[PDB]
């Protein structure tokens, strides 16, 4: 059949958060989700149309001393329209974390499990499942190298060879 | 499936027609339903980031002298991006009513069952079911109160905190 | 069916505590869980009359250097009129913790499955399902910025809209 | 297969399009307003041809057509107005399209003419041909057109007085094209 | 097994044989069959370490007029390694066609479907099913335009992110 | 039938020649003399790859195909001298063509490896895979040879040796081409 089923584990995101500017509601991490931020998906949708999220969690692996202050708060708004980046927004989205900059935590987002389209276009609801949001809480005392992991899982339909 | 189904009547409009203002297919009402327009829906869609529209009718009730003249056109255009205000377009749709002013009537339209987004997009299409139309036939004579209320009935998914 | 039944992690509290003012027995947080502490809980208690607490989890995520001294202990007093804050009170709960202030946490609190009020009135028993309460234990060495996370389920009930 | 000068061509299913839709609708075919003393006796209210470019739907559905024959036909007098309305309306299709004769008599010789009064409506059921009609306008309108339909007032009108007159028509199309004005 | 069946059809080949320069024996088409030969397979590839060949067609498509003169031999060496280039090595081989310039064909060559390797490496043997060679039969008289496309079916496996 | 600009080529039996051909003997891989006193332990005797070049017809036969599995494998070390001879062989076969290792103990610990005297002949039982091997030369020898067949002396020969080893070989010849060196 047209449908293939891909996973993987990919950085969405890689960010370095000196010093000190690390203010509470910065945003460290703002992704919007699509296959091209995915490498093996980026080339799995180059060969496909369309393609379904089923599984899709996130990983925050901040690189840090122990003796680092802060912490972050890390959430998957399932609206790639939606601009709200606040502490309350994230908290309120279905699996969003809050952790001190020296502990690693995983994000199970809830979606809509809806046929996306691979490709861009006018609206990006059709084409992103969502976006992730990493912004501080309190103040980091050292400097902070973030890396914002996805395990993801698609399902690819209607093939085709698109460009980017 | 944490989707949560919600119901309940609530007023979309009000509006005041003085008399002699409303001459022939003057727009008294032009609502486009979306679920801030409502109420209750308004913080049930704050809450959520999708909805499906189960059921939905509205009802006009305009608060009038039984002596008044003239009469009321209503209905619901399934297209909320469309932007023809006139009794055909009225005429062509499932479910209008045509009205005295003192009469109360019920509109129940043709509409999308589809998953939409509770907040604004740049597509209209997959943010709301469409848009209720109320229109003049003829002139009145008295001042003109009527209050458009709708039976609804939602399933919400996806938890947010939205913005207005 | 009027009851909805509503999930959600959100931040009840946020608090700062300098380096050496956090003495023994100090409050760190006394929080009375209220629908409104709760974003998409304040808005659902706010189209709804009566909600019942199923659910009801905390997270203690204190956000601070691994060389911080002293540490904290957590508990949810189920009596939210109860204004006893020593060590004693706290430890009798079902569920209370006591941890190093580098060291997240989780409570498990007991508490009696009763219908609320989501609007508030005289008597807070009637609306409350208790308190969080957050005290130090011994003395901290660094600046602690603590996070004190609800995951919490409810069942809403008597649809109406509440005004703040 | 040897290599030809010429193949032959391989269309198929050229000439081949649905030639019958049957096509029902309801519309506004006029729609008048007379302020007070205006409507004075034989005074002609409403006077429309029924042609399939009255009709909106119909219209766009004849200019990919050439035939149609009007298997159902009716008419409603809606005036929305008060009961302290003096006078009243006499109303009738005439099979006729070409006759333009406007008086109480000749709609009332019809059969299904309705004489009422202004806070009274009505349902006009009218004679007219089942056969095949033209879609495009021609020299003679008696092959394009069932008839015409009238309105005339059989009193003077004591207040403001709005009438809408309405169709329910159904046809059948026939004879598939393209029509261009 | 996580193997992802793929398949499409996809051109090999372009070549422009001008009018004269058609002698008999002439390498028209030296094609090693790799999924970087392929343009969707070759994304295919681009995210996948293994690769079997469960279907492999080839479709001379030339493109000339019928008054033209000469012929072409296709055929499928299922050896990668091999370098023999003649009349003579084609018609040995099975799936092999010959036929005027303005006739097109189908190879349905003898291929091996072991596990072969997507990326190249010391040894073909384990990295190609073996290559195609279209050779002309006579002299050309007019400008020949021969495409030759491949429908194909693949199984791949072990993921990865290769370079070009 | 008209005439046609070009008629379609009548070529129709065009590749379709035999695929599968079992070819069965038994031939000689190597012939060895050793003067007395040069047989020392660990002397190699025999050295042979196992390729379709190394026998003749199977050669012959390979140039004509691509694919080779060796159905049927073995060995017979027939030394042609006196029972007055001294000394002794090990002989054995490495089913890794890539291997170059030459010791008593490398032959003993493979499978149906024969330890003898000089004056007695012994079968060679190996263990070869069955997969199908390329009959044409590349970079990795092992994917062309299923091993190589040893032969060493044990102790020190008294006489002069005459060591000849024989093959018997059953091939499935598959996948046809014609190859050239
Ligand atoms: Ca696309
Ligand atoms: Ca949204
Ligand atoms: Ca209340
Ligand atoms: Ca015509
Ligand atoms: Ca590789
Ligand atoms: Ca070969």
Tied chains: 1, 2, 3, 5.
Excluded at 34 to 46: E, F, N, Q, S
Excluded at 73 to 100: E, I, M, S, Y
Excluded at 150 to 155: G, K, L, N, Q
Aim: net charge neutral.
């Amino acid at each position: 059949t047209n449908d293939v089923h891909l996973s993987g584990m990919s950085r969405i995101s890689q960010a370095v958060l000196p010093a000190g500017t690390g203010t509470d509601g910065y945003v460290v991490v703002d992704a919007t989700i699509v296959p091209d931020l995915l490498p093996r998906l980026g080339h799995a949708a180059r060969i496909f149309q369309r393609y379904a999220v089923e599984t899709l969690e996130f990983e925050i692996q901040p690189m840090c001393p122990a003796n680092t202050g802060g912490g972050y708060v890390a959430g998957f708004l399932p609206d790639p329209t939606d601009n709200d980046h606040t502490f309350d927004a994230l908290q309120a989205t279905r699996g969003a974390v809050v952790a001190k900059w020296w502990e690693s935590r995983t994000v199970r987002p809830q979606y809509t499990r809806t046929l996306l389209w691979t490709s861009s276009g006018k609206e990006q609801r059709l084409t992103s499942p969502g976006r992730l949001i990493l912004l501080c809480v309190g103040n980091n005392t050292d400097v902070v190298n973030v890396s914002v992991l996805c395990r993801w899982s698609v399902r690819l339909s209607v093939p085709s060879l698109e460009t980017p």
